[PDB]
Amino acid sequence: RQIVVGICSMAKKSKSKPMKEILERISLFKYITVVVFEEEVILNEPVENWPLCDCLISFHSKGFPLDKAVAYAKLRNPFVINDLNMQYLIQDRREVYSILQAEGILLPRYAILNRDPNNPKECNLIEGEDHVEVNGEVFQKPFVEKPVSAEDHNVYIYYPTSAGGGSQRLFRKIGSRSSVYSPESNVRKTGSYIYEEFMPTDGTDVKVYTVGPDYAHAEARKSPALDGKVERDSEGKEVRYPVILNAREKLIAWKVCLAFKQTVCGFDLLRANGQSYVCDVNGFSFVKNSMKYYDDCAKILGNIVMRELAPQFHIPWSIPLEAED
Numbered sequence: 001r002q003i004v005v006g007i008c009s010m011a012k013k014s015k016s017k018p019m020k021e022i023l024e025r026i027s028l029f030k031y032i033t034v035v036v037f038e039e040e041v042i043l044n045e046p047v048e049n050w051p052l053c054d055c056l057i058s059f060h061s062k063g064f065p066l067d068k069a070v071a072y073a074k075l076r077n078p079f080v081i082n083d084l085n086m087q088y089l090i091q092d093r094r095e096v097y098s099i100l101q102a103e104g105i106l107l108p109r110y111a112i113l114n115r116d117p118n119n120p121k122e123c124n125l126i127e128g129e130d131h132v133e134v135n136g137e138v139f140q141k142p143f144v145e146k147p148v149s150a151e152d153h154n155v156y157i158y159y160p161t162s163a164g165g166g167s168q169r170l171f172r173k174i175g176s177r178s179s180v181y182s183p184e185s186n187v188r189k190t191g192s193y194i195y196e197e198f199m200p201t202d203g204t205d206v207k208v209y210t211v212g213p214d215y216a217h218a219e220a221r222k223s224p225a226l227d228g229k230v231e232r233d234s235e236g237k238e239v240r241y242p243v244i245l246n247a248r249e250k251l252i253a254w255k256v257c258l259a260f261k262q263t264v265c266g267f268d269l270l271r272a273n274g275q276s277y278v279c280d281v282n283g284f285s286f287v288k289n290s291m292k293y294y295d296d297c298a299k300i301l302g303n304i305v306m307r308e309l310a311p312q313f314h315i316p317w318s319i320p321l322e323a324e325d
């Protein structure tokens with residue numbers, strides 16, 4: 001019989017153009033059949049009624065019942081491409097940063113301010129005009145303030161008096177905008193946050209997309225905080241610039257992929273002061289315009305499936321060479 005690769009995610013993702021481009025290529029593997037789990041099934045059917053698969057590609061996004069996916073994987077014991085239990089931790093910036101540190105991955109110097117919403121003034125924060133002290137640790141402006149929820153994209157940057165003060169408020173893109181300037185100079189009064197050193201880049205973010213630990217595609221885009229105007233192309237896509245990862249960065253990608261156990265894993269690098277710092281690890285993420293990425297990604301995923309499952313299915317398999325980017 002065919003090796004079944006099941007795809008289990010919210011329809012917003014499963015039916016996205018990048019996903020459909022990748023799945024059509026995976027389907028070209030002679031011995032692989034792709035089955036995309038319907039959103040109505042994921043949300044409303046007990047996991048005992050979900051389709052069978054031999055290999056499961058499943059990932060959390062807003063509204064996804066991760067508990068069910070974990071229960072399904074437990075029930076059916078498929079080969080799992082992106083580890084499901086780690087996807088709970090990926091939702092928490094504190095957990096993400098803890099893992100990066102444990103792996104010796106460079107990241108911004110940071111401190112966690114946990115607030116008890118019941119008693120919010122009891123927290124370990126002292127604020128001055130050009131700095132904060134979080135658990136006694138001093139962050140001079142510019143510094144960055146991130147909601148502990150990785151799914152909350154309201155990231156604020158605070159400017160020093162020397163640069164005019166105020167703050168830049170970043171958010172999930174709305175049309176042509178990715179951030180706005182605010183005259184507000186004081187930090188947020190409610191919520192729990194990570195405070196971190198601002199890393200000066202050349203005005204671009206590097207977005208990295210792994211497919212297993214030995215492949216990573218990178219591309220750059222204008223830092224959302226710079227002025228907040230999104231650079232769009234004639235097709236309405238964000239303008240993305242060429243990047244080739246150096247040896248250090250290729251190692252970072254290998255570590256991130258393995259440490260988070262996410263074969264397909266997006267993360268962000270800040271190229272600053274002659275090094276590269278990880279500031280965000282997103283897990284399963286979508287490259288949006290590269291035909292070669294779709295080719296490479298589908299081929300690597302198919303080969304991973306074949307290498308793991310062909311012997312069990314009595315299918316001959318010789319593992320081929322794969323590009324590193």
Ligand SMILES: O=P(O)(O)O[C@H]1[C@@H](OP(=O)(O)O)[C@H](OP(=O)(O)O)[C@@H](OP(=O)(O)OP(=O)(O)O)[C@H](OP(=O)(O)O)[C@H]1OP(=O)(O)O
Nearest residue numbers: 013061062172173175207237238266282284285286287288
């Ligand atoms: O990780 P993914 O593939 O799930 O996508 C993430 C995010 O990627 P990230 O994880 O690296 O931060 C995307 O940002 P980018 O890297 O393309 O700039 C964003 O696209 P966007 O803002 O629409 O950007 P445009 O298409 O307008 O240029 C998308 O937002 P939505 O589709 O509106 O929900 C997000 O989904 P979710 O987190 O569920 O809101």
Ligand SMILES: Nc1ncnc2c1ncn2[C@@H]1O[C@H](COP(=O)(O)OP(=O)(O)O)[C@@H](O)[C@H]1O
Nearest residue numbers: 108144153155196197198199205223224279280
């Ligand atoms: N420590 C930092 N120094 C400089 N810029 C940062 C820093 N942390 C985040 N940024 C900027 O803010 C953007 C959003 O932060 P990020 O941690 O990636 O949040 P998100 O999970 O919402 O994508 C980054 O892409 C980068 O441009």
Ligand SMILES: [Mg+2]
Nearest residue numbers: 027029030032
């Ligand atoms: Mg096929």
Ligand SMILES: [Mg+2]
Nearest residue numbers: 060061282284
């Ligand atoms: Mg996500």
Ligand SMILES: [Mg+2]
Nearest residue numbers: 172173174175
């Ligand atoms: Mg959007």
Ligand SMILES: [Mg+2]
Nearest residue numbers: 268279280281
């Ligand atoms: Mg990010």
Ligand SMILES: [Mg+2]
Nearest residue numbers: 150280281282
């Ligand atoms: Mg993120």
